[PDB]
């Protein structure tokens, strides 16, 4: 790996890799977005050294390729009966993998745990980087769309029991507990990220419509906190309908102070005070005392 | 309920706990509004009355605490600190009476400091400005702009502060029985809150002079009485989080002892230089008045009469320490009293050599200092870097001194009222800095820049407004607007061209003061995009008025501000600038107005001062025509069409046609960009044979530029007649005083010497 | 597609490839020359 | 208008003609009980000023139906008060106010 | 009128800056020492873990603030008058007819001194306060430089020690990368920008003498480090620079002297090529060449320290 070059050439067809060298337009913009085609001569001067990755970032790569396939599995399965109420014999063909989908969120989360604060500076700070780097690997290659698409999938449902089960068996316990597994991957994936932080700002409406879920609520404020302090520039984009609906929730979950703690975030940005945020605040929860 | 039963409920104390958080989380950093209306919820009545509470839990002990400080000591406490470190001093004889004073009043010179901040300082420094808070007003309905932004809610400061200092005595006296039930919690929710309390009304000077006394006596009775019982706050064991507030304390002292060293120094200015002043007279009118001794007297005068003042003085001063020399012709009684003040200085700032007591403030904080650290491992990074950042400053006086003084001024009397509404206006504009921009805060800060701008001041003391941060605060403001997500014109204009418009009427007073904005031209020259300058200023105005004419600084200019300006007008000269297309203006791959109004900066910083820079002319012209899509590059003879042709389809289409959009048509304006273009290139131009004639590199120039634009057009252009003088027109094209930037092309090129000199 | 993107792409799981010998047994040889081979991209789990 | 029902006997023949500043403590409370304003907790009367009214002239009016000594327990409708829009953060929108002024009348 | 009918205000202005550039700040501070004297003498005053007073805490302070990684270094003013004050500990005591006795006397002094500091930690400061600089040439890391040649002035082989076993120890890349940077900012002697300046001074308004290189200091101040570091013919510490094996890349240190020395060669000569047909030098040029030449000295120096003990 010490700067040792080497060429890759075909056995069958015997050709060589150079660059495709094709018409240069500012179409797609393209630094080096170049096809890798299989050429004669080229230009003599693509040979390759070769470097070891480590082993983090190998076992990261594994567990990605694995929990693709098991999520596109699920998802798969998901949309399967989405549109069939069968309604007598709700199971039909294959199953849902309900207990390989728990096992693997479960050891996701422990995967992506924060680390404790019993340790020294050195090793803490080792450790913090190491999580932040393996979350972005888990970020880029995909990840964060697809827990979306099988939260949002998943949440098409909502009496949990029978609306729930009219394209579905034996998966009324393994409901509650995927959702609440979901959410917090979720939560522990943007945790203290601020470029996922910062990527996940998109769906700030999505999130703060799900507050009112009755059934994900709590990972879902957490969630949601997680991104306005980890990412001070979503301010702006709340508007009175988000305040509304947080007052709301508190109101129908009853007396919490993470609800305040979120309020506090949406509150004075990163050294800048939010005069609009402040006075939606101060005009919608009190002066509408009981 | 009792709200003492909190102290059980813990489910109910926890949620009180973040109520309060809120309280004074959606009313900080400013907005006095909302501290209004949070007086119907928490009266003065239930502050007060939790204040001298000690059966109130922990955690709701101080978080009334700070919801009293956040409500009504907070933004009138946050503009004071903010502002505190510029010293501005008058020369009345209040402040006359004012000196350094290490005591020689009934003992020697060298005494006890003499208890520090309860002096005379006398710097201008504005009220607070408090409102009563009233819920039966008639709340008028105007506008956001137009609205007169609240002040922060009224409370009886006269029982805030004996009720404040009545607290503080009986915690340090019920904290020496080591009683097993403190106020709160524990003794850290005993001593904090109150502590806060007292920090904050210090720094607002609302203590008197004997409530200073009662302070001081409290920290430490053995060092600051003057004429284990009653032990002071530094001998009992304390915490950190009781360690962190006893160190902004004793911040505030220093500052204080900082302030009155300042101003007393100030003060003595007056004292000396008046002295000098008379002296100066009486020895210039005894050489001069008396010519008897010779008649080549002009050499003893030309380095007293014919010098500059700075130059005066600094020669003056270099006396009385020059190696036993003392070079001057200056007296020796008046010599001996500035080193008596100089050696008085000194024993009390810091240095004097020329289990023993403190028996001042310089050595007691940096004994308890040793002692926090050396008795246990603090843990706490904040009071680490506090307690460092207080000990540095105490056992370097000098150097603190030394930093404060460029911050230093001095001001006559009749004109503190003059720097009374400046100062207020500023502290304005330092308040709005950490809000997000909004039409209130937009309308509030055009007015405060404009009462800044004439107010009396402004031209009188440029050099006051070099420090004190006068221009750094206003640009400040200008980058967070102009930054935006890709886009800033759209976002809040017309207050731009404001910020713009001080900065260009900064540097217009003196040279130091275009001096120091010329420092800031990468930023500057980078965000002179789309403009839109159509009244006011532009981001480009600003960065050619830092370049009018220096001579020296012009002279300073890198190569990439030169070569960004040309790829930029190469741009900006390539397309139709679609803001002019929303009007419906024609389309044409070529920008006139932009054009013309981009390489105005370059005709600034290549024509210094009637001359032209050969540092820079060879630059400019290299790159202007290095790429061939610039000058107009359509018709100016690099596309095959030709600078004479220009012209001739321009009048067609200028001369009142229905072919164009509405005062933006395009008339003159398709005509001026290649007459600056021409008035550009002739700046660049060599003057005269001093380097023409001498050097080859001249002429070289003056060759390429010359094959440029040929003789041959520029008789035609000359000789077409401007237009009708009578009925009149207007800025539509070809304008009576256009023939000035052929004609100086003509000049400094070609010249005239028997054949043009007839037709 | 295989694609010559670089620079910021350089420290991701995409430029991750594997080799596999066609050696089953002793697949842990030392890549001599010549030697054929079944390149393996791990994150999409797919062979050049 | 508003309801000049009192509470206090107090002294008649002092009834504010015009142009004179009054002083008045007034206790503030909305529907249901709540309270949200009351000079009593600051101390401090007041002193009501009559033309320039700078006021709720509901309150304006009920004050003005009073005395020396009589208490008024003012029952301001939400006409001749904030309005549809009210005191933003304190008094919401459309509601009647009840007043408790008691005018001492120290000019 | 220079002498009088200025007002009262502007002439006590006027007395303000000439007092301060005149009589202040002379010569007489002298507390660099008294205060790293008392700091740690009083570690106990009545009394294992427990740090000396603050020396190695405030040390370990820094070093902590160091190890946030932040992706910039802040300004951080405290650290500019305390990294200066250590630095001066050692540098201002320093230790025809000096003794055999008083010159053990000097070298064991600044031993002592030295010893204060490296026990507390203050080696690996500087290692770290210079990596996260990641080649930023701000005043950062001026002051860094300047305590690890004080901290390491006359080749303690301790010091040396301490400093080779961290590096080897985290295995980390990113000092050499800081190193590597620092190195080809570096400014060399400049003829355009010199005859800029002789239009200016023919006419403050002169950056006197500070605008054909500039970086003096600096310049002389980072390979000194790097010549102070394999001194005393350290055989381990010259194989590392060109090398590292724990580290998965290398920097070769060695070549990044050499390649710096390049330009200053090239830029020397086209200064050559400028005097040549004169035969007189201006005092400006004499300046000029003074600096680059007591510049290409250092670097000579450290080269030579890179070869020695074969």
Same mark, same amino acid.
């Given at each position: 790996?010490?700067?040792?070059?080497?060429?890759?050439?075909?056995?069958?067809?015997?050709?060589?890799?150079?660059?495709?060298?094709?018409?240069?337009?500012?179409?797609?913009?393209?630094?080096?977005?170049?096809?890798?085609?299989?050429?004669?001569?080229?230009?003599?001067?693509?040979?390759?050294?070769?470097?070891?990755?480590?082993?983090?970032?190998?076992?990261?790569?594994?567990?990605?390729?694995?929990?693709?396939?098991?999520?596109?599995?699920?998802?798969?399965?998901?949309?399967?009966?989405?549109?069939?109420?069968?309604?007598?014999?709700?199971?039909?063909?294959?199953?849902?993998?309900?207990?390989?989908?728990?096992?693997?969120?479960?050891?996701?989360?422990?995967?992506?745990?924060?680390?404790?604060?019993?340790?020294?500076?050195?090793?803490?700070?080792?450790?913090?980087?190491?999580?932040?780097?393996?979350?972005?690997?888990?970020?880029?290659?995909?990840?964060?769309?697809?827990?979306?698409?099988?939260?949002?999938?998943?949440?098409?449902?909502?009496?949990?029991?029978?609306?729930?089960?009219?394209?579905?068996?034996?998966?009324?316990?393994?409901?509650?507990?995927?959702?609440?597994?979901?959410?917090?991957?979720?939560?522990?994936?943007?945790?203290?990220?601020?470029?996922?932080?910062?990527?996940?700002?998109?769906?700030?409406?999505?999130?703060?419509?799900?507050?009112?879920?009755?059934?994900?609520?709590?990972?879902?404020?957490?969630?949601?906190?997680?991104?306005?302090?980890?990412?001070?520039?979503?301010?702006?984009?709340?508007?009175?309908?988000?305040?509304?609906?947080?007052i709301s929730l508190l109101d129908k979950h009853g007396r919490n102070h993470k609800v305040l703690d979120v309020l506090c975030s949406l509150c004075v940005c990163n050294g800048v005070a939010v005069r609009s945020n402040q006075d939606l605040i101060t005009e919608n929860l009190l002066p509408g005392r009981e | 309920m009792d709200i003492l039963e909190l102290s059980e409920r813990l489910d109910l104390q926890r949620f009180h706990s973040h109520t309060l958080r809120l309280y004074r989380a959606v009313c900080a950093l400013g907005n006095?509004?909302?501290?209004?209306?949070?007086?119907?919820?928490?009266?003065?009545?239930?502050?007060?009355?939790?204040?001298?509470?000690?059966?109130?839990?922990?955690?709701?002990?101080?978080?009334?605490?700070?919801?009293?400080?956040?409500?009504?000591?907070?933004?009138?406490?946050?503009?004071?600190?903010?502002?505190?470190?510029?010293?501005?001093?008058?020369?009345?004889?209040?402040?006359?009476?004012?000196?350094?004073?290490?005591?020689?009043?009934?003992?020697?010179?060298?005494?006890?400091?003499?208890?520090?901040?309860?002096?005379?300082?006398?710097?201008?420094?504005?009220?607070?400005?408090?409102?009563?808070?009233?819920?039966?007003?008639?709340?008028?309905?105007?506008?956001?702009?137009?609205?007169?932004?609240?002040?922060?809610?009224?409370?009886?400061?006269?029982?805030?502060?004996?009720?404040?200092?009545?607290?503080?005595?009986?915690?340090?006296?019920?904290?020496?029985?080591?009683?097993?039930?403190?106020?709160?919690?524990?003794?850290?929710?005993?001593?904090?809150?109150?502590?806060?309390?007292?920090?904050?009304?210090?720094?607002?000077?609302?203590?008197?002079?004997?409530?200073?006394?009662?302070?001081?006596?409290?920290?430490?009775?053995?060092?600051?009485?003057?004429?284990?019982?009653?032990?002071?706050?530094?001998?009992?064991?304390?915490?950190?989080?009781?360690?962190?507030?006893?160190?902004?304390?004793?911040?505030?002292?220093?500052?204080?002892?900082?302030?009155?060293?300042?101003?007393?120094?100030?003060?003595?200015?007056?004292?000396?230089?008046?002295?000098?002043?008379?002296?100066?007279?009486?020895?210039?009118?005894?050489?001069?008045?008396?010519?008897?001794?010779?008649?080549?007297?002009?050499?003893?005068?030309?380095?007293?009469?014919?010098?500059?003042?700075?130059?005066?003085?600094?020669?003056?001063?270099?006396?009385?320490?020059?190696?036993?020399?003392?070079?001057?012709?200056?007296?020796?009684?008046?010599?001996?009293?500035?080193?008596?003040?100089?050696?008085?200085?000194?024993?009390?700032?810091?240095?004097?050599?020329?289990?023993?007591?403190?028996?001042?403030?310089?050595?007691?904080?940096?004994?308890?200092?040793?002692?926090?650290?050396?008795?246990?491992?603090?843990?706490?990074?904040?009071?680490?870097?506090?307690?460092?950042?207080?000990?540095?400053?105490?056992?370097?006086?000098?150097?603190?001194?030394?930093?404060?003084?460029?911050?230093?001024?001095?001001?006559?009397?009749?004109?503190?009222?003059?720097?009374?509404?400046?100062?207020?206006?500023?502290?304005?504009?330092?308040?709005?800095?950490?809000?997000?921009?909004?039409?209130?805060?937009?309308?509030?800060?055009?007015?405060?820049?404009?009462?800044?701008?004439?107010?009396?001041?402004?031209?009188?003391?440029?050099?006051?407004?070099?420090?004190?941060?006068?221009?750094?605060?206003?640009?400040?403001?200008?980058?967070?607007?102009?930054?935006?997500?890709?886009?800033?014109?759209?976002?809040?204009?017309?207050?731009?061209?404001?910020?713009?418009?001080?900065?260009?009427?900064?540097?217009?007073?003196?040279?130091?003061?275009?001096?120091?904005?010329?420092?800031?031209?990468?930023?500057?020259?980078?965000?002179?995009?789309?403009?839109?300058?159509?009244?006011?200023?532009?981001?480009?105005?600003?960065?050619?008025?830092?370049?009018?004419?220096?001579?020296?600084?012009?002279?300073a200019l890198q190569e990439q501000d030169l070569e960004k300006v040309v790829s930029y007008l190469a741009g900006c000269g390539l397309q139709s600038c679609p803001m002019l297309l929303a009007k419906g203006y024609p389309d044409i791959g070529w920008n006139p107005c932009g054009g013309e109004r981009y390489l105005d900066f370059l005709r600034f910083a290549v024509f210094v001062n009637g001359e032209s820079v050969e540092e820079n002319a060879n630059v400019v012209v290299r790159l202007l025509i290095r790429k061939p899509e610039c000058?107009?590059?359509?018709?100016?003879?690099?596309?095959?069409?030709?600078?004479?042709?220009?012209?001739?389809?321009?009048?067609?289409?200028?001369?009142?046609?229905?072919?164009?959009?509405?005062?933006?048509?395009?008339?003159?304006?398709?005509?001026?960009?290649?007459?600056?273009?021409?008035?550009?290139?002739?700046?660049?131009?060599?003057?005269?044979?001093?380097?023409?004639?001498?050097?080859?590199?001249?002429?070289?120039?003056?060759?390429?530029?010359?094959?440029?634009?040929?003789?041959?057009?520029?008789?035609?252009?000359?000789?077409?007649?401007?237009?009708?003088?009578?009925?009149?027109?207007?800025?539509?094209?070809?304008?009576?005083?256009?023939?000035?930037?052929?004609?100086?092309?003509?000049?400094?090129?070609?010249?005239?010497?028997?054949?043009?000199?007839?037709? | 597609?295989?694609?010559?993107?670089?620079?910021?792409?350089?420290?991701?799981?995409?430029?991750?490839?594997?080799?596999?010998?066609?050696?089953?047994?002793?697949?842990?040889?030392?890549?001599?020359?010549?030697?054929?081979?079944?390149?393996?991209?791990?994150?999409?789990?797919?062979?050049? | 208008?508003?309801?000049?029902?009192?509470?206090?006997?107090?002294? &008649?023949?002092?009834?504010?003609?015009? $142009? %004179?500043?009054?002083?008045?403590?007034? =206790?503030?409370?909305?529907?249901? /009980?709540?309270?949200?304003?009351?000079?009593?907790?600051?101390?401090?009367?007041?002193?009501?000023?009559?033309?320039?009214?700078?006021?709720?002239?509901?309150?304006?009016? &009920?004050?003005?139906?009073?005395?020396? $000594? %009589?208490?008024?327990?003012?029952?301001? =409708?939400?006409?001749?008060?904030? /309005?549809?829009?009210?005191?933003?953060?304190?008094?919401?929108?459309?509601?009647?106010?009840?007043?408790?002024?008691?005018?001492?009348?120290?000019? | 009128?220079?002498?009088?009918?200025?007002?009262?205000?502007?002439?006590?202005?006027?007395?303000?800056?000439?007092?301060?550039?005149?009589?202040?700040?002379?010569?007489?501070?002298?507390?660099?020492?008294?205060?790293?004297?008392?700091?740690?003498?009083?570690?106990?005053?009545?009394?294992?873990?427990?740090?000396?007073?603050?020396?190695?805490?405030?040390?370990?302070?820094?070093?902590?603030?160091?190890?946030?990684?932040?992706?910039?270094?802040?300004?951080?003013?405290?650290?500019?008058?305390?990294?200066?004050?250590?630095?001066?500990?050692?540098?201002?005591?320093?230790?025809?007819?000096?003794?055999?006795?008083?010159?053990?006397?000097?070298?064991?002094?600044?031993?002592?001194?030295?010893?204060?500091?490296?026990?507390?930690?203050?080696?690996?400061?500087?290692?770290?306060?210079?990596?996260?600089?990641?080649?930023?040439?701000?005043?950062?890391?001026?002051?860094?430089?300047?305590?690890?040649?004080?901290?390491?002035?006359?080749?303690?082989?301790?010091?040396?020690?301490?400093?080779?076993?961290?590096?080897?120890?985290?295995?980390?890349?990113?000092?050499?990368?800081?190193?590597?940077?620092?190195?080809?900012?570096?400014?060399?002697?400049?003829?355009?920008?010199?005859?800029?300046?002789?239009?200016?001074?023919?006419?403050?308004?002169?950056?006197?003498?500070?605008?054909?290189?500039?970086?003096?200091?600096?310049?002389?101040?980072?390979?000194?480090?790097?010549?102070?570091?394999?001194?005393?013919?350290?055989?381990?510490?010259?194989?590392?620079?060109?090398?590292?094996?724990?580290?998965?890349?290398?920097?070769?240190?060695?070549?990044?002297?050499?390649?710096?020395?390049?330009?200053?060669?090239?830029?020397?000569?086209?200064?050559?090529?400028?005097?040549?047909?004169?035969?007189?030098?201006?005092?400006?040029?004499?300046?000029?060449?003074?600096?680059?030449?007591?510049?290409?000295?250092?670097?000579?120096?450290?080269?030579?320290?890179?070869?020695?003990?074969?």
């Amino acid at each position: 790996y010490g700067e040792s070059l080497c060429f890759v050439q075909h056995v069958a067809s015997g050709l060589w890799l150079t660059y495709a060298a094709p018409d240069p337009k500012a179409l797609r913009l393209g630094v080096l977005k170049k096809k890798a085609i299989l050429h004669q001569e080229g230009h003599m001067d693509d040979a390759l050294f070769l470097t070891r990755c480590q082993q983090e970032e190998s076992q990261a790569a594994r567990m990605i390729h694995s929990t693709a396939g098991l999520y596109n599995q699920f998802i798969k399965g998901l949309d399967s009966f989405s549109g069939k109420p069968r309604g007598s014999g709700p199971p039909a063909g294959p199953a849902l993998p309900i207990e390989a989908v728990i096992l693997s969120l479960q050891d996701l989360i422990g995967y992506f745990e924060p680390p404790s604060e019993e340790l020294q500076h050195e090793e803490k700070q080792s450790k913090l980087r190491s999580l932040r780097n393996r979350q972005s690997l888990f970020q880029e290659e995909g990840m964060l769309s697809l827990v979306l698409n099988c939260i949002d999938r998943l949440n098409v449902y909502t009496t949990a029991a029978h609306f729930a089960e009219y394209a579905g068996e034996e998966a009324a316990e393994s409901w509650k507990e995927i959702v609440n597994l979901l959410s917090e991957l979720l939560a522990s994936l943007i945790r203290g990220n601020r470029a996922n932080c910062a990527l996940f700002s998109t769906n700030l409406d999505w999130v703060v419509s799900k507050l009112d879920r009755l059934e994900a609520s709590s990972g879902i404020l957490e969630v949601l906190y997680c991104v306005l302090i980890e990412s001070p520039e979503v301010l702006n984009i709340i508007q009175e309908n988000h305040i509304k609906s947080i007052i709301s929730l508190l109101d129908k979950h009853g007396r919490n102070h993470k609800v305040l703690d979120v309020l506090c975030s949406l509150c004075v940005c990163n050294g800048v005070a939010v005069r609009s945020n402040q006075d939606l605040i101060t005009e919608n929860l009190l002066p509408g005392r009981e | 309920m009792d709200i003492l039963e909190l102290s059980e409920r813990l489910d109910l104390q926890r949620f009180h706990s973040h109520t309060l958080r809120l309280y004074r989380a959606v009313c900080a950093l400013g907005n006095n509004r909302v501290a209004h209306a949070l007086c119907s919820h928490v009266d003065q009545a239930q502050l007060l009355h939790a204040l001298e509470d000690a059966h109130l839990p922990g955690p709701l002990r101080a978080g009334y605490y700070d919801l009293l400080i956040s409500i009504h000591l907070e933004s009138a406490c946050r503009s004071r600190r903010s502002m505190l470190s510029e010293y501005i001093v008058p020369l009345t004889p209040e402040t006359r009476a004012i000196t350094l004073f290490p005591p020689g009043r009934k003992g020697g010179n060298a005494r006890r400091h003499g208890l520090p901040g309860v002096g005379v300082t006398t710097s201008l420094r504005p009220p607070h400005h408090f409102s009563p808070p009233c819920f039966v007003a008639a709340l008028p309905a105007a506008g956001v702009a137009e609205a007169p932004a609240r002040l922060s809610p009224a409370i009886p400061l006269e029982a805030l502060r004996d009720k404040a200092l009545r607290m503080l005595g009986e915690a340090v006296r019920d904290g020496g029985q080591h009683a097993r039930d403190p106020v709160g919690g524990s003794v850290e929710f005993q001593f904090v809150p109150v502590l806060k309390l007292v920090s904050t009304l210090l720094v607002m000077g609302i203590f008197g002079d004997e409530d200073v006394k009662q302070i001081l006596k409290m920290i430490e009775p053995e060092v600051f009485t003057e004429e284990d019982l009653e032990e002071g706050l530094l001998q009992m064991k304390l915490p950190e989080s009781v360690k962190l507030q006893m160190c902004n304390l004793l911040e505030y002292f220093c500052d204080q002892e900082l302030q009155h060293r300042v101003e007393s120094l100030a003060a003595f200015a007056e004292r000396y230089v008046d002295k000098l002043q008379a002296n100066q007279r009486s020895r210039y009118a005894l050489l001069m008045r008396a010519f008897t001794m010779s008649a080549a007297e002009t050499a003893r005068r030309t380095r007293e009469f014919r010098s500059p003042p700075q130059e005066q003085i600094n020669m003056l001063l270099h006396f009385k320490d020059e190696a036993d020399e003392e070079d001057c012709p200056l007296p020796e009684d008046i010599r001996q009293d500035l080193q008596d003040f100089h050696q008085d200085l000194l024993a009390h700032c810091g240095i004097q050599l020329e289990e023993k007591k403190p028996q001042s403030l310089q050595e007691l904080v940096s004994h308890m200092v040793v002692r926090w650290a050396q008795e246990d491992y603090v843990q706490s990074p904040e009071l680490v870097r506090a307690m460092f950042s207080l000990l540095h400053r105490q056992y370097d006086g000098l150097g603190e001194l030394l930093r404060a003084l460029p911050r230093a001024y001095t001001i006559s009397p009749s004109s503190v009222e003059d720097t009374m509404s400046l100062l207020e206006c500023l502290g304005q504009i330092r308040s709005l800095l950490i809000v997000q921009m909004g039409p209130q805060e937009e309308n509030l800060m055009i007015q405060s820049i404009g009462n800044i701008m004439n107010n009396k001041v402004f031209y009188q003391h440029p050099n006051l407004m070099r420090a004190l941060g006068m221009h750094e605060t206003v640009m400040e403001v200008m980058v967070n607007v102009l930054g935006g997500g890709e886009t800033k014109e759209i976002r809040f204009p017309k207050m731009v061209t404001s910020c713009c418009r001080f900065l260009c009427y900064f540097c217009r007073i003196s040279r130091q003061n275009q001096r120091s904005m010329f420092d800031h031209l990468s930023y500057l020259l980078e965000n002179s995009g789309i403009g839109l300058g159509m009244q006011g200023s532009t981001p480009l105005d600003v960065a050619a008025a830092s370049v009018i004419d220096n001579n020296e600084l012009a002279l300073a200019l890198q190569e990439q501000d030169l070569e960004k300006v040309v790829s930029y007008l190469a741009g900006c000269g390539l397309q139709s600038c679609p803001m002019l297309l929303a009007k419906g203006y024609p389309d044409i791959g070529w920008n006139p107005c932009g054009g013309e109004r981009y390489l105005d900066f370059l005709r600034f910083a290549v024509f210094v001062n009637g001359e032209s820079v050969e540092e820079n002319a060879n630059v400019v012209v290299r790159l202007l025509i290095r790429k061939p899509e610039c000058f107009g590059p359509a018709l100016r003879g690099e596309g095959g069409s030709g600078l004479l042709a220009a012209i001739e389809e321009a009048i067609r289409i200028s001369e009142d046609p229905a072919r164009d959009g509405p005062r933006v048509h395009l008339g003159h304006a398709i005509m001026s960009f290649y007459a600056a273009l021409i008035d550009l290139l002739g700046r660049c131009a060599p003057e005269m044979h001093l380097i023409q004639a001498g050097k080859g590199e001249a002429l070289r120039i003056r060759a390429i530029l010359r094959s440029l634009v040929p003789l041959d057009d520029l008789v035609g252009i000359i000789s077409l007649p401007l237009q009708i003088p009578t009925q009149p027109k207007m800025s539509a094209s070809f304008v009576p005083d256009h023939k000035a930037s052929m004609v100086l092309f003509l000049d400094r090129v070609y010249g005239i010497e028997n054949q043009d000199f007839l037709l | 597609l295989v694609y010559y993107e670089g620079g910021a792409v350089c420290t991701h799981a995409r430029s991750l490839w594997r080799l596999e010998p066609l050696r089953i047994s002793w697949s842990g040889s030392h890549l001599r020359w010549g030697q054929p081979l079944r390149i393996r991209h791990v994150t999409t789990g797919r062979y050049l | 208008g508003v309801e000049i029902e009192t509470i206090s006997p107090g002294d &008649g023949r002092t009834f504010p003609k015009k $142009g %004179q500043t009054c002083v008045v403590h007034y =206790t503030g409370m909305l529907q249901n /009980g709540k309270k949200f304003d009351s000079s009593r907790d600051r101390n401090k009367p007041f002193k009501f000023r009559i033309g320039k009214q700078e006021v709720i002239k509901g309150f304006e009016e &009920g004050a003005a139906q009073m005395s020396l $000594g %009589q208490r008024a327990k003012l029952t301001c =409708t939400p006409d001749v008060a904030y /309005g549809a829009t009210g005191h933003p953060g304190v008094i919401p929108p459309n509601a009647t106010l009840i007043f408790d002024v008691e005018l001492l009348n120290l000019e | 009128t220079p002498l009088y009918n200025l007002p009262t205000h502007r002439a006590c202005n006027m007395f303000l800056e000439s007092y301060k550039a005149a009589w202040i700040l002379t010569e007489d501070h002298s507390f660099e020492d008294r205060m790293i004297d008392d700091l740690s003498k009083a570690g106990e005053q009545e009394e294992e873990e427990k740090k000396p007073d603050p020396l190695h805490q405030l040390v370990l302070h820094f070093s902590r603030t160091a190890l946030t990684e932040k992706s910039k270094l802040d300004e951080d003013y405290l650290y500019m008058a305390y990294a200066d004050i250590m630095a001066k500990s050692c540098h201002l005591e320093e230790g025809v007819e000096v003794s055999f006795e008083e010159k053990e006397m000097e070298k064991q002094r600044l031993l002592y001194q030295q010893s204060r500091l490296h026990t507390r930690g203050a080696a690996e400061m500087v290692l770290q306060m210079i990596s996260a600089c990641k080649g930023e040439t701000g005043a950062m890391v001026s002051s860094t430089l300047k305590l690890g040649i004080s901290i390491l002035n006359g080749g303690n082989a301790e010091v040396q020690q301490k400093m080779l076993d961290y590096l080897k120890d985290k295995k980390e890349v990113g000092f050499f990368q800081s190193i590597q940077a620092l190195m080809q900012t570096c400014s060399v002697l400049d003829l355009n920008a010199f005859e800029r300046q002789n239009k200016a001074e023919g006419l403050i308004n002169r950056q006197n003498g500070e605008k054909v290189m500039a970086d003096d200091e600096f310049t002389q101040d980072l390979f000194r480090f790097l010549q102070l570091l394999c001194e005393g013919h350290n055989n381990d510490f010259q194989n590392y620079l060109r090398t590292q094996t724990g580290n998965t890349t290398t920097i070769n240190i060695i070549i990044c002297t050499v390649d710096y020395l390049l330009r200053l060669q090239e830029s020397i000569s086209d200064f050559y090529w400028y005097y040549s047909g004169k035969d007189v030098i201006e005092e400006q040029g004499k300046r000029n060449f003074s600096k680059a030449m007591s510049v290409a000295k250092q670097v000579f120096n450290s080269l030579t320290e890179y070869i020695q003990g074969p």
